[PDB]
Amino acid sequence: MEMEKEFEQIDKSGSWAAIYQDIRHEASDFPSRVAKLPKNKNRNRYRDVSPFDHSRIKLHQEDNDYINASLIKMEEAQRSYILTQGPLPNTVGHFWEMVWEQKSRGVVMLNRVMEKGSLKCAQYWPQKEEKEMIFEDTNLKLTLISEDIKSYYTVRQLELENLTTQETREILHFHYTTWPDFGVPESPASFLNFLFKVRESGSLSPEHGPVVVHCSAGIGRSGTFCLADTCLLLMDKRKDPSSVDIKKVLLEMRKFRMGLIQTADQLRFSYLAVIEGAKFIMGD
Numbered sequence: 001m002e003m004e005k006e007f008e009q010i011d012k013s014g015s016w017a018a019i020y021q022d023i024r025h026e027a028s029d030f031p032s033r034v035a036k037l038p039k040n041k042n043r044n045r046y047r048d049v050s051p052f053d054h055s056r057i058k059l060h061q062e063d064n065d066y067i068n069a070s071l072i073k074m075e076e077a078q079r080s081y082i083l084t085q086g087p088l089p090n091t092v093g094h095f096w097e098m099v100w101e102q103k104s105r106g107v108v109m110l111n112r113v114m115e116k117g118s119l120k121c122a123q124y125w126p127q128k129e130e131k132e133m134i135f136e137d138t139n140l141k142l143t144l145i146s147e148d149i150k151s152y153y154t155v156r157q158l159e160l161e162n163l164t165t166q167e168t169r170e171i172l173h174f175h176y177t178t179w180p181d182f183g184v185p186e187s188p189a190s191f192l193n194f195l196f197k198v199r200e201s202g203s204l205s206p207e208h209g210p211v212v213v214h215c216s217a218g219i220g221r222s223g224t225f226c227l228a229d230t231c232l233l234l235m236d237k238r239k240d241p242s243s244v245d246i247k248k249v250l251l252e253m254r255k256f257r258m259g260l261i262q263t264a265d266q267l268r269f270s271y272l273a274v275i276e277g278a279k280f281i282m283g284d
């Protein structure tokens with residue numbers, strides 16, 4: 001396997017840091033002027049993580065159309081993802097407005113509400129069937145329908161109601177609950193099992209709007225999820241699966257959102273996930 005001998009060549013040489021900095025050096029730089037307007041300061045979790053103007057998701061309202069979210073459009077793979085930050089106390093209603101407007105079927109959450117003793121995102125979904133949430137600023141109602149709690153992830157069925165039209169939709173919440181507070185998982189087996197559960201749901205498929213993916217900033221763990229998916233899809237589709245270059249896929253994705261893959265360890269974990277997942281592209 002091409003990728004695995006590169007991995008072994010990089011691992012034996014211990015050059016992960018050097019490969020990673022080469023990506024950072026060649027990555028696209030595009031303007032983010034809307035994200036930096038003074039009226040949007042409380043709509044951004046981190047001062048150094050902004051959506052590019054060319055690829056940002058626009059909210060369908062005349063007041064202020066801004067959300068910290070980007071459309072990643074992978075032309076050859078025929079997949080689209082929205083990557084966004086963990087919602088803030090004043091952006092929970094914007095978040096559900098985006099899910100409604102973009103016709104998403106799935107939300108993928110790769111972080112816990114509290115990590116390292118600090119809050120990484122708002123409690124943006126209801127925890128009990130009989131205690132629904134109402135977002136008065138965007139005129140939406142959200143109800144917990146069911147909850148399936150497993151060892152590495154939880155799947156929730158949610159009902160989102162547009163209170164303006166009384167239309168309802170079923171949204172699936174895929175919550176990966178065991179990514180460690182520091183570093184990356186030791187094995188990618190549970191991450192790959194999670195990705196195939198999202199795929200089987202239909203959430204990644206062209207008959208729906210793009211899946212919404214988030215962690216705290218929406219670039220690290222979120223980056224890893226969409227890079228592994230797109231690389232495995234390209235191996236399925238091409239005559240020479242051995243032509244799939246993970247560094248080139250990552251630079252293509254970084255034309256649409258800055259900073260995807262935050263550390264040299266997340267880059268190595270991404271290689272490991274694609275290598276292991278590839279076994280199934282190898283008819284097993």
Ligand SMILES: O=C(O)c1ccc2[nH]ccc2c1
Nearest residue numbers: 001002003235241242278281
């Ligand atoms: O690198 C390779 O040799 C190779 C061959 C077949 C494959 N199918 C999916 C990945 C892959 C790599």
